[PDB]
């Protein structure tokens, strides 16, 4: 529920934070399954608006 | 005044909300991208329309 609640502004903020962790690899390999579960659920939930949006920086972040 | 319509996507259960007030994700009926976490009072279910007077603000908690 705590992941379903938040709006898309905080969803985009979440993805920026996830990219920052991917830069900071050691935290990623510390907490790989929690990060992956939260990321896959947040994109499955807000999938429609995220593919409806257009943001090249978001494209590079997702890549 | 220009009012806007919005369709309910998903009722957001298990949030800590005041009794009677429900928290609901709505989406703009005009543009199918924008989703906003608004608040409702009456009995609501999914996929019914709902009129918004201000679109910018979003409803946070009420303790």
């Amino acid at each position: 529920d705590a992941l379903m609640v938040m709006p898309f502004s905080y969803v985009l903020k979440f993805l920026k934070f996830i990219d920052t962790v991917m830069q900071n690899k050691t935290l990623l390999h510390s907490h790989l399954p929690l990060i992956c579960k939260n990321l896959f659920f947040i994109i499955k939930f807000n999938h429609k608006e995220l593919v409806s949006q257009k943001n090249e920086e978001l494209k590079l972040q997702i890549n | 005044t220009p009012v806007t319509l919005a369709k309910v996507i998903k009722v957001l259960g298990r949030t800590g909300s005041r009794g009677g007030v429900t928290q609901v994700r709505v989406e703009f009926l005009e543009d199918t991208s924008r989703t906003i976490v608004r608040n409702v009072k009456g009995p609501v279910r999914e996929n019914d329309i709902l009129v918004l007077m201000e679109s910018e603000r979003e409803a946070r908690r009420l303790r």
């Binding site: 529920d1 705590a2 992941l3 609640v5 938040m6 905080y10 | 949030t15 800590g16 908690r61």
Partner: peptide, 11 residues
């Protein structure tokens, strides 16, 4: 005392 979701959002 906040709720999960809220504390996640402010952090």
């Amino acid at each position: 005392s906040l709720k999960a979701g809220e504390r996640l959002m402010e952090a």
